[PDB]
Design a protein around this ligand. Sequence first.
Ligand SMILES: CCCCCCCCCCCCCC(=O)SCCNC(=O)CCNC(=O)[C@H](O)C(C)(C)COP(=O)(O)OP(=O)(O)OC[C@H]1O[C@@H](n2cnc3c(N)ncnc32)[C@H](O)[C@@H]1OP(=O)(O)O
Ligand SMILES: Cc1cnc(NC(=O)c2cccc3[nH]c(-c4cc(Cl)ccc4N4CCNCC4)nc23)s1
Ligand SMILES: [Cl-]
Ligand SMILES: [Cl-]
Length: 426
Amino acid sequence: PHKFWNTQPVVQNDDSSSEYSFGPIEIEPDSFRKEIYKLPDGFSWFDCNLWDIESQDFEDTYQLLKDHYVEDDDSQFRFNYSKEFLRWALCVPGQKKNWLVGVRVNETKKMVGFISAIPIKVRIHNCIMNTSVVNFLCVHKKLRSKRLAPVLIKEITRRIRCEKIFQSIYTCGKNITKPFTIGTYWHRIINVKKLLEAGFIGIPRNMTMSSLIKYHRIPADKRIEGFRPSVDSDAEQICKLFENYFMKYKDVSNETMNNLINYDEINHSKELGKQAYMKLDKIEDLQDKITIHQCFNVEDVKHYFTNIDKVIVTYVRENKNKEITDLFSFFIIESTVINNERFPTINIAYSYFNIANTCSLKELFNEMLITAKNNNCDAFNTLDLMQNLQVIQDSKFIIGTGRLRYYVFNWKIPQISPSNVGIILF
Ligand SMILES: CCCCCCCCCCCCCC(=O)SCCNC(=O)CCNC(=O)[C@H](O)C(C)(C)COP(=O)(O)OP(=O)(O)OC[C@H]1O[C@@H](n2cnc3c(N)ncnc32)[C@H](O)[C@@H]1OP(=O)(O)O
Ligand SMILES: Cc1cnc(NC(=O)c2cccc3[nH]c(-c4cc(Cl)ccc4N4CCNCC4)nc23)s1
Ligand SMILES: [Cl-]
Ligand SMILES: [Cl-]
């Protein structure tokens, strides 16, 4: 039984609707709480200065997440996001200073809480909007189970609404309310010895370390040339590549895609905002198409689909006309081995956005797997989003533990396959 989420404009697990529809759950442009939320006495909010990678805030935030952010089911691994990664993930085009929210102990100046939002643009069926992604919610372990998380969530909500934004996207490794999709984790083992020594996998009784190495090898043959890291000047071509990709997989007509309802222009009125409601006749109308995805302008492409060592890798394929025709990308996050002092961390690649036009998605992922190996990644992680299942099938990926639940705040999305979802959170 929820005490917080049952009061929020999200679809509840017991939602009893017999129709598939889209649109805002509520249109409440001026009725939200505007006063800052109270923290326990002795604590204070601050805008986290992640704008200087050398800042004390950045050091405190890095340390908070390193020691208290997400752990796996059995508390063997914990994420160790680098400062360079956090800068790339949070200082995005259009970011607001007050969407990076810390909690500090007044007497000691020690940071004990963080929550972030980043701005993104999303298409949801026939609508388009500026929205937010909430991520990196973290409370110091000594302060857990004291209901601080709803305080942080309400305060980031207030800060997002003060920017005239009333929706958000977020994921969680557990069920909270009703998710609009569920992602499955898939792991491609790259460095077998390192992952055995870390305890991520073990040596099966019918195998050996040498046969395990042999089985998990990234296939070497069948290389496709023409791939190269992207550079800044690619941004326009990459932006066009994504447009054609989303146009290819659209779940609405061509005319609708060129005439999306801009929710930004109507979310100020309970009457005009009603235009965003859309009844879907059949859920099969969405099969094999993309229903919700991020939208990238050229500035966004330049920031996200770049190449920063140990953070983000983006390659493009050119054709004989030197036109970009394909793209693969993955980001890199280190994880700490909690129960290990001598082998403390491991580098993990995570599939980002991938577009295959001149080769198969399998061929592209094989090139990306080799590039991940050459970037010293110990494993390659992917979700069954977009068309990734085509690659995950008939492959050597191994299923992960748990599931990734996708949520949208204050919007209705029918439950859809993760193949219909083009939203990757960091
Ligand atoms: C318009 C704009 C809207 C913007 C806002 C949109 C929503 C964004 C929402 C957040 C997006 C997060 C995106 C990411 O970053 S996902 C990763 C979340 N972070 C971690 O897992 C790191 C390690 N764990 C922790 O730091 C704490 O355990 C956290 C802080 C997670 C909870 O701390 P604590 O363990 O000390 O708990 P509590 O007693 O204070 O609070 C209990 C209440 O909190 C609800 N709860 C617990 N965990 C989560 C969770 N991960 N998402 C949403 N709700 C959560 C729980 O259901 C209950 O409510 P109810 O069940 O009684 O109702
Ligand atoms: C040696 C190791 C290899 N992989 C490791 N993963 C962990 O320890 C881990 C712990 C807790 C939660 C996790 N979620 C994911 C993940 C996995 C895949 Cl396949 C695709 C996407 C994923 N996430 C990343 C976090 N944001 C949401 C999406 N991984 C973890 S440890
Ligand atoms: Cl679920
Ligand atoms: Cl499971």
